[PDB]
Design a protein around this nucleic acid. Structure first.
Lengths: 124, 104, 159, 176
RNA sequence: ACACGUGCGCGAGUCGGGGGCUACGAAAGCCGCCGUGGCGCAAUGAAGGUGAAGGCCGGCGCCGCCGGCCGAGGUGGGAUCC
RNA sequence: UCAGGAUAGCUGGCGCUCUCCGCAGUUUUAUCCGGUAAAGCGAAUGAUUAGAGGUCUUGGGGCCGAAACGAUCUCAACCUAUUCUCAAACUUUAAAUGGGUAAGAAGCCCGGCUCGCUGGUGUGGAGCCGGGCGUGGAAUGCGAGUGCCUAGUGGGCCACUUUUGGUAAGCAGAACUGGCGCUGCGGGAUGAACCGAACGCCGGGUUAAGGCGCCCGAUGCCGACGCUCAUCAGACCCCAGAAAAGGUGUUGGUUGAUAUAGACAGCAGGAUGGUGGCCAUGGAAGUCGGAAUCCGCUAAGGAGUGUGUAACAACUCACCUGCCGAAUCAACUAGCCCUGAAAAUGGAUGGCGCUGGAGCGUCGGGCCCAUACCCGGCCGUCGCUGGCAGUCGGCAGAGCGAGAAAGAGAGUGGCGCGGACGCUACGCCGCGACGAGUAGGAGGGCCGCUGCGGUGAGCCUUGAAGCCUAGGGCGCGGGCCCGGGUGGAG
RNA sequence: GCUCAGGGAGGACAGAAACCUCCCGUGGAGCAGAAGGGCAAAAGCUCGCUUGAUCUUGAUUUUCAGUACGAAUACAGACCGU
RNA sequence: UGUGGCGGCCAAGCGUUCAUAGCGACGUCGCUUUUUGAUCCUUCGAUGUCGGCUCUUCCUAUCAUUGUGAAGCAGAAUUCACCAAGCGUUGGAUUGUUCACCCACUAAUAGGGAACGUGAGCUGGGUUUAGACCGUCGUGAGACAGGUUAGUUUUACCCUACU
RNA sequence: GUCUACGGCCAUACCACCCUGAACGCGCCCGAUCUCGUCUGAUCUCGGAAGCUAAGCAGGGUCGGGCCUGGUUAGUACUUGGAUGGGAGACCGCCUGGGAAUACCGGGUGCUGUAGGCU
């Protein structure tokens, strides 16, 4: 989040359900669904010699370094976030409330401040 | 039989398919459409550059002394600090050998 | 079909503002246009000689030619599919210096002064522009007072 | 909004981000009966934008914590003041409910306005919720329970769990 | 018939297609003093026509030239190479 | 020229130049640009109602003129301060959405040369050399660039919002974006366009939009709180048949009255006199009416409710009760139900049916399933200008996935006779993402037909072609190969 | 060099209207024509002098295929006007 | 659904008196597809296009008959409205007519729909081919939303429906 | 403090009336021989220096008009995006962002460039 990204979020608002993640959720997503963009190929992060060989220049040499740089939004968030292939989550187990409308008016679109972690559990 | 007169319906979609390509911008644009008094004078200035050639290279060889004049006259934890030092393999080529001897 | 023609839909566009009619201030003619400076186009009704077409009124191009009374602008005009950078001869009453370049050239000169100063010391000056970051933690002092409660007003049929 | 489940009372206080003209802008408090904080903070900005010239981007939410009931084991009377949109004009009402929690009485109010008047969560504004004494109530549906020696039977107890056999020999009893 | 792509042969050339020579075969082979010729290597003008790079150094701060030395541009980007 | 063509656009194919600094259907920061929405008329142009205060610049009219001054109530005209209402072809103000440009080395800051341009002036401007400065100067995303040849198409339609003409149209004509056409799939019973979501061949899981009495997968929950009875109930986007008006039906509310100073009624006793005052005055003994409308007498006397009604003698209408005993009255408002509500074959909340809902409004928990989303199998395409010529073997030493640019380096000094597969290189192998499709375009066919040059030391009277077949199989498919029968020369 | 439309007030015949004189006058006038824009020591009105409404290459704008015509804008080389 | 038809709501007035027995101005909300427009969606390798005769069925916006409420219903006669489509709703002169108008009868002589019901059911008077006449228009060939006269009406033996 | 000449932005500078203006200026003012032009020396052109702040001009004043600039109007009107929201419709409510304009109430009433005087 900066000034530039929030004004980009609010114009794709009815198509996304976003919020502020927990340390647990950041652990769960990057350990269970962690794939690297190594040679433009979606390769599973089974070892640390993928992260170390790709992101060696920024001193991100393991999974705990990757998870630290994501969570505590550091210097090389850009080159660590762009390393991570977008997370292919499942369908929500328990269903949605309503896709079409905003979170505030019953639905499941727009900004879900601390409540995004619950949606992360059911789709991860 | 009458017919539909005009629309621009599918046209926005059509334009963007191959994308809207901006004019091929370069360094050194052409002097076509520039004032031809100014242009003929600029051409005489170009033509008469080699007449003052001797002062150009002579000043450049005197100013190249002005380089040699002054360029010779010119001249977070303590443990993670230590383990990031030991583990990386040209700075820590002897600290690992010390460690290796320290099993005996 | 519409009537074609050069000044068709230029009624309020090429008009002079309210109580800004009559004699044209002379500083307009005394501003100095070089070959390259970026210039925004705005047609004027008072002076009928050497106007830009209504296609260009409000567009910004750059100067490639300066003759006695007028300047040559290179303006990006859009047609259907493609964009054309094209070369118009417009009189200098219909022309202004754009202040878009007077905010960049101050950045470069200040940006370079911040590398003349603080290159030898080791003190590293962040030069690039950040977007307004998420706000910092702070303590909102209730200096004695308890906050006033706002409860919605009951409806009254006004007019 | 959408009054999902039992609502919770929230204390949402807010203020304008200090500019140069005033470094100390005054704090304003509000009571939001809403399903959670994320809707409580949105309904705060609704009412704050209508009373004051204050916005979400032109301000910050200082504190939004759930207000608990200080006596959820006492039976209380709750007089609520309304402001709802009909299909012709808007109307103010005064509505008494009998409950242990205020937030329960406000959920009970939203159901009663929905039932009787076909008025929904986006339409209804709540301005004043006060717990009342037994002697200060004008509605007969709530007063009739101000009887220290109350006695009534449960007359026609319709048989629930009808599909437990689904095929019984005997007709079910009603008198208990 | 034309245009563009593509494969092959020769290359400032190229091509015998018409002609001649000595069962398959009406094929294949050969000619060069059989390239006439075609297309190419030069354009532009309606035409008569014309028809594709230079500085310097002396003698005659200058000659129309007598000569003398060397000579197919420059800038920016450019796979490789050094 | 209007049932057609040429011409751009959209399409495909062939590539080629680069990359292991460039771009963008976006945002941020600066910076201009605008005259729609809105607002305004005690601001211009135009349309527009209303009283005021002034007055002659005005006329009139009658008022005491022999004639004219003044004049006097003046009325419209006029001026001044106000007031009600408007504008697609008006406007001082004036948005949201929007449209350009800039965010660096195609740059900076230094010297020095040229000019026939320009001049008080190496002045101004431009062009040329040789220099030195990377912290690559907003966020995010992504490999870019460029040239040939080119088919189809040039009847369109629908929807949210804006919008022109028309009473309106499943009408005619526009802007923007999205769809159908070219496209199936789950929901809307049904349906080119709605809602959800786009598709290689399958198993597990789970969802969307919709559902869960039975048809019909899933509420057979001891679901929550109200509302409503219909002799025409009601029942889900587009959508498939209704309004003004109204109800002492019923359920909420709003405002104002009377309440032990004793109410809606219940039933009496009385409603008097000046006065046959009034206005024109057939008539106003109160009585098509109109206007004055008090009192002498008090619990009621009101110039009043209907009266045969010109009134009249005369029945009847507010009043305080005579009997009687606390909570009522009055006007709006909005929910559901009802009236308003009439068409032709018999009839359609999809049907049956449903009223302690299987209806209506507000909400729990659980559950059902798409060709969508996750995990996995298999096929293909595309990408990696990917890997392999190291099968380097008694002359051998079998290594080169590993976070960090480089040599498993080389010399001179200080018994047993052994070791899988491989590599039609036009082959074989490894990893990742993807797959709708009409007109149209390209590729690959160990798909098929008939004839010619080569070739199979091909097949065939111990039975060729052809044909028939509940026989055996292969291939994604075009097709094909065997078995049995018939047939008789390819 | 002046200043317009309209108005106020004065002046023989002369009035609602001929002519003279002063004051107020942001355009309420005029600019050949339709309409919009524009303009006040002017783009209007009145005077004086004239022929740039002349010869000649290219560039560019508008419609646009980014073609022609029509019309236009900035230059350059002449000869001229004021 | 403009237009044609039919129905409400308000109450200014009509009605000797008296808004509402019966009516209803200025306004205003609907309904219907028995009127005429408006449109071009279906049909131009064909859906036989005017009327009448014939014959069945359906609608109600009720003319008559049954049962009823109300009148400015004394009786008789008549008018308004309700439940209500079971059965009726005719014979003729003129016209091709649908429509119209008149005679007579009658309880009453109500209005409609079914591809503006119904041509392998008829008919052929009307329109609407080819022959001719008149009038107006055209120089003429010819034209007429003028009048007039004469002018070929085909097939079932198939499936269903019905008997 | 302030003027003169030439100006820049072009009403915080304009309009109505009143008061005060030291010293140089700027003016009104005085004339018509030469210059020059008119019906007319009023204007224009010219040669002057007896007078005068009366006017122009300057500074200031006014519960002034206008102009400028805040507040209010008002998070009102409108508006980007969203919904299988309400409603017979006409149009509304909500969510997600942006946000005006009169009447009405205050405050202000020229800034300044170069060159040359006066105090």
């Amino acid at each position: 989040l900066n000034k530039a990204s929030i004004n980009m979020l609010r114009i794709v608002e009815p198509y996304i359900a976003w919020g502020y993640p927990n340390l647990k959720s950041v652990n769960e997503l990057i350990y269970k669904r962690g794939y690297g963009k190594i040679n433009k190929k979606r390769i599973a992060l089974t070892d640390n010699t993928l992260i170390a060989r790709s992101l060696g220049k920024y001193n991100i040499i393991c999974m705990e370094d990757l998870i630290h740089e994501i969570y505590t939004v550091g210097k090389h968030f850009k080159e660590a976030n762009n390393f991570l292939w977008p997370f292919k989550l499942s369908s929500p187990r328990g269903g949605m409330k309503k896709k079409t409308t905003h979170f505030v008016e019953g639905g499941d679109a727009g900004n879900r401040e601390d409540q995004i972690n619950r949606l992360i559990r059911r789709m991860n | 039989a009458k017919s539909k007169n005009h629309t621009t319906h599918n046209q926005s979609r059509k334009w963007h398919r191959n994308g809207i390509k901006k004019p091929r911008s370069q360094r050194y644009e052409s002097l076509k459409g520039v004032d031809p008094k100014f242009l003929r004078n600029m051409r005489f200035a170009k033509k008469h550059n080699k007449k003052g050639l001797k002062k150009m290279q002579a000043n450049n060889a005197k100013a190249m002394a002005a380089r040699a004049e002054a360029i010779k006259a010119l001249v977070v934890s303590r443990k993670l600090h230590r383990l990031a030092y030991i583990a990386h393999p040209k700075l820590g080529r002897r600290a690992r050998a010390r460690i290796a001897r320290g099993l005996r | 079909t519409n009537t074609k023609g050069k000044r068709r839909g230029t009624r309020y566009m090429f008009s002079r503002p309210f109580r800004k009619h009559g004699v044209v201030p002379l500083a307009t003619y005394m501003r100095i246009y070089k070959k390259g400076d970026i210039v925004d186009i705005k047609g004027m009704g008072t002076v009928q000689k050497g106007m830009p077409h209504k296609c260009y009124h409000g567009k910004t191009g750059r100067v490639y030619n300066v003759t006695q009374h007028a300047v040559g602008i290179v303006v990006n005009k859009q047609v259907k599919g493609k964009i054309l950078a094209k070369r118009i001869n417009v009189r200098i009453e219909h022309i202004k210096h754009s202040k878009s370049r007077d905010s960049f050239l101050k950045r470069v000169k200040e940006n370079d002064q911040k590398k003349k100063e603080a290159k030898e010391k080791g003190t590293w000056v962040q030069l690039k522009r950040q977007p307004a970051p998420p706000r910092e933690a702070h303590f909102v002092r209730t200096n004695g007072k308890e906050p006033e409660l706002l409860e919605p007003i009951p409806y009254e049929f006004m007019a | 909004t959408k009054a999902s489940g039992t609502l919770r009372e929230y204390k949402v206080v807010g203020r304008c981000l200090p500019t140069s003209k005033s470094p100390a802008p005054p704090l304003y408090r509000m009571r939001i009966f809403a399903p959670n904080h994320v809707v409580a903070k949105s309904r705060f900005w609704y009412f704050v934008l209508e009373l004051k010239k204050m916005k979400k981007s032109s301000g910050e939410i200082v504190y939004c914590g759930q207000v608990f009931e200080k006596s959820p084991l006492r039976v209380k009377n709750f007089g609520i003041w309304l402001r709802y949109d009909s299909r012709s004009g808007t109307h103010n009402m005064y509505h008494e409910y009998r409950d242990l929690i205020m937030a329960s009485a406000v959920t009970q109010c939203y159901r009663d306005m929905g039932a009787r008047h076909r008025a929904r969560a986006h339409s209804i504004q709540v301005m004043k919720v006060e717990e009342m004494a037994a002697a200060r109530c004008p509605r007969p549906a709530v007063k009739q329970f101000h009887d220290s020696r109350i006695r009534f039977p449960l007359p026609h107890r319709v048989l629930r769990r009808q599909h437990k056999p689904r095929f019984t020999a005997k007709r079910p009893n009603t008198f208990f």
